[PDB]
Design an enzyme around this catalytic site. Structure first.
Site, PDB file in Angstrom:
ATOM      1  N   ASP A 180       0.863  -1.215   0.000  1.00  0.00           N
ATOM      2  CA  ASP A 180       0.000   0.000   0.000  1.00  0.00           C
ATOM      3  C   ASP A 180       0.886   1.248   0.000  1.00  0.00           C
ATOM      4  O   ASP A 180       0.524   2.206  -0.693  1.00  0.00           O
ATOM      5  CB  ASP A 180      -0.964   0.002   1.191  1.00  0.00           C
ATOM      6  CG  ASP A 180      -2.341  -0.577   0.891  1.00  0.00           C
ATOM      7  OD1 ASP A 180      -2.442  -1.492   0.063  1.00  0.00           O
ATOM      8  OD2 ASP A 180      -3.309  -0.057   1.443  1.00  0.00           O
ATOM      9  N   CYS A 214      -1.748   0.334 -13.515  1.00  0.00           N
ATOM     10  CA  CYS A 214      -1.871   0.402 -12.044  1.00  0.00           C
ATOM     11  C   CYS A 214      -3.114   1.287 -11.858  1.00  0.00           C
ATOM     12  O   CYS A 214      -4.091   1.110 -12.611  1.00  0.00           O
ATOM     13  CB  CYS A 214      -0.519   0.799 -11.456  1.00  0.00           C
ATOM     14  SG  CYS A 214       0.207   2.288 -12.194  1.00  0.00           S
ATOM     15  N   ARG A 220       3.882   2.370 -10.806  1.00  0.00           N
ATOM     16  CA  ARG A 220       4.245   0.934 -10.887  1.00  0.00           C
ATOM     17  C   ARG A 220       4.339   0.489 -12.352  1.00  0.00           C
ATOM     18  O   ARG A 220       5.235  -0.306 -12.666  1.00  0.00           O
ATOM     19  CB  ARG A 220       3.218   0.084 -10.143  1.00  0.00           C
ATOM     20  CG  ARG A 220       3.098   0.474  -8.678  1.00  0.00           C
ATOM     21  CD  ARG A 220       1.949  -0.266  -8.053  1.00  0.00           C
ATOM     22  NE  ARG A 220       1.578   0.356  -6.814  1.00  0.00           N
ATOM     23  CZ  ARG A 220       0.562  -0.043  -6.033  1.00  0.00           C
ATOM     24  NH1 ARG A 220      -0.215  -1.048  -6.392  1.00  0.00           N
ATOM     25  NH2 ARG A 220       0.338   0.569  -4.875  1.00  0.00           N
ATOM     26  N   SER A 221       3.441   0.961 -13.209  1.00  0.00           N
ATOM     27  CA  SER A 221       3.393   0.613 -14.655  1.00  0.00           C
ATOM     28  C   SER A 221       4.703   1.040 -15.299  1.00  0.00           C
ATOM     29  O   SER A 221       5.245   0.319 -16.138  1.00  0.00           O
ATOM     30  CB  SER A 221       2.209   1.274 -15.344  1.00  0.00           C
ATOM     31  OG  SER A 221       0.967   0.803 -14.821  1.00  0.00           O
ATOM     32  N   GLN A 261       6.911   7.699 -10.241  1.00  0.00           N
ATOM     33  CA  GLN A 261       6.201   8.775  -9.497  1.00  0.00           C
ATOM     34  C   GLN A 261       7.068   9.308  -8.350  1.00  0.00           C
ATOM     35  O   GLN A 261       6.937  10.491  -8.025  1.00  0.00           O
ATOM     36  CB  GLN A 261       4.864   8.257  -8.965  1.00  0.00           C
ATOM     37  CG  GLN A 261       3.722   8.510  -9.925  1.00  0.00           C
ATOM     38  CD  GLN A 261       2.382   8.114  -9.360  1.00  0.00           C
ATOM     39  OE1 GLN A 261       2.062   6.937  -9.243  1.00  0.00           O
ATOM     40  NE2 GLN A 261       1.570   9.105  -9.046  1.00  0.00           N
TER      41      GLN A 261
END
Ligand SMILES: c1csc(-c2ncc[nH]2)c1
EC number: 3.1.3.48
Length: 281
Positions: A180, A214, A220-221, A261
């Protein structure tokens, strides 16, 4: 070489600084189609838009818009579609895109619920006997099989074009253990997952580009595509240490904004490529 560059930035704690240089250097292209008022409810986040030049177009005459970008890595001979997790109202558009681009695999790097909020619509069937029909795009989706493992699930899906009665098998690769907050401690299960996608044939030029998502389709992608492309370039080049992650990331950012990110995702990408290089050399 990046192993040495890793130790430098790590020992000097310069990750936030490297990350800021990438932010500063990154391309900025128009995203006029994404900002049209008629497309407001097709976007999960108002600050995450595909560039007009690289956006995927739906083949419906009405509204061709989906929040999705084609990332074309010419030297590596790899393409990827990066997209947001579908919304309740775009599940039909998502599967229309999979159909129209001839994709063989869908890579999902998020859970449907994280931090107590919905990050994604449930866009695939949970049971064999309860198929989903997308009336807006005339598609039927059936769960054929589901193989649940510790770190990921692979599902075989049948997508049927109700207009032409053609059917295709789609593979759904679902990485279920991204935490998370932050990044995985070790890149081992992420690398294992990436080798499983490769082994399926989903990343191969015979097929349309893999769909990767994602929640926003940038963090994450981003890590997924960056690791794959970097490892493939290390196989292809006379000198594997000529591969500069930062350059590859910047080339990928010409196609979709914001890929990777956080400075932690950048550090994780270095670690994934460094570790993956051992299984490749
Ligand atoms: C932001 C733009 S559209 C949207 C939405 N649609 C359906 C559920 N949430 C959230």
């Amino acid at each position: 070489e990046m192993e040495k560059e890793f130790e430098q930035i790590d020992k000097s704690g310069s990750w936030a600084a490297i990350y800021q240089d990438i932010r500063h250097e990154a391309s900025d292209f128009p995203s006029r189609v994404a900002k049209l008022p008629k497309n407001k409810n097709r976007n999960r986040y108002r600050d995450v838009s595909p560039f007009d030049h690289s956006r995927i177009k739906l083949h419906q005459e009405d509204n061709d818009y989906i929040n999705a970008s084609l990332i074309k890595m010419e030297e590596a001979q790899r393409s990827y579609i990066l997209t947001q997790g579908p919304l309740p109202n775009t599940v039909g558009h998502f599967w229309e895109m999979v159909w129209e681009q001839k994709s063989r695999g869908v890579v999902m790097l998020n859970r449907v619920m994280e931090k107590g909020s919905l990050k994604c619509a449930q866009y695939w069937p949970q049971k064999e006997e309860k198929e989903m029909i997308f009336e807006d795009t005339n598609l039927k989706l059936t769960l054929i099989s589901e193989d649940i493992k510790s770190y990921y699930t692979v599902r075989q899906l049948e997508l049927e074009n109700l207009t032409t009665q053609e059917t295709r098998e789609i593979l759904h690769f679902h990485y279920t253990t991204w935490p998370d907050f932050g990044v995985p401690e070790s890149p081992a299960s992420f690398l294992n997952f990436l080798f499983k996608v490769r082994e399926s044939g989903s990343l191969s030029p015979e097929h349309g580009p893999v769909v990767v998502h994602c929640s926003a389709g940038i963090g994450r992608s981003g890590t997924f595509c960056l690791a794959d492309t970097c490892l493939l370039l290390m196989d292809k080049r006379k000198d594997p240490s000529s591969v500069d992650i930062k350059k590859v990331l910047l080339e990928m950012r010409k196609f979709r904004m914001g890929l990777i990110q956080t400075a932690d995702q950048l550090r994780f990408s270095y670690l994934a490529v460094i570790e993956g290089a051992k299984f490749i050399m």
